Structure formats: C-alpha cells, structure tokens
Amino acid sequence: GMLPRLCCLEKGPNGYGFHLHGEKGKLGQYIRLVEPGSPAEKAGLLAGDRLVEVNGENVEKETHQQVVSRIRAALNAVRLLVVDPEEDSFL
C-alpha cells in the first residue's frame, strides 16, 4: 500500500538466496540476483530493490560490510525493508 515492502525471510539450508551490492560513489546497498524458489523469492524480494532496514535498523548509509554483517549475524530470520529506488528517495 503506502508502507515500504517488508520481506521476512526464514534462513534455509542454502542461505537466503540473494546477492547484496553497492555501487562506486553512490553509497547504498541493493538486492541483486534473487534465486528462484528461495526464501528471498518467497518473501517477495526483487533484484533492483534498495535495502533500507535490516531487522528494524536503518542501513541506508552503512558500508557494504556493515550491512552484510548484520544480515549474517541474525540467527533464524531477517526482516528486510526495501523500496523501489525509482519511486523512493531519502532527503
């Protein structure tokens, strides 16, 4: 609706099933390569999505390493708050 899409994935045997990546100069992390049939795909993630929060914490301006660390440390699940970058901007 109005709220950013919230994607709640349960960690599977083969991880979550998606890549995360930044872009030189333009800080920020983005979903990339979502595997068919994975938690990521089941939870609604889409390559192209920008990652705003991981488990209720703002990671919009955090390094690639910080964000991956956070995602990786959670135990069973991660809630990923994403927006479509063509429709959302931070000010």
Binding of residue 22 to Cl ion (CB under 5 A): no
The whole-angstrom separation of Cα 11 and Cα 48 is 21
- Amino acid identity for residue 36 in this structure: P
Please say which residue, 56 or 87, places its beta carbon nearer to Cl ion.
87
> According to CB under 5 A, which residues from 45 to 64 bind Cl ion?
47
Rg (CA), the chain: 12
Q: Rounded to the nearest whole angstrom, what is the least distance from the CB of residue 38 to Cl ion in the complex? A: 14
Site string for Cl ion, 26-45 (x = CB under 5 A): ------xx------------
Q: Rounded to the nearest whole angstrom, what is the least distance from the CB of residue 18 to Cl ion in the complex? A: 9
- The owner of tokens 């609706």 is 1
For the chain, first and last CA: distance in Å? 21
Binding of residue 83 to Cl ion (CB under 5 A): yes
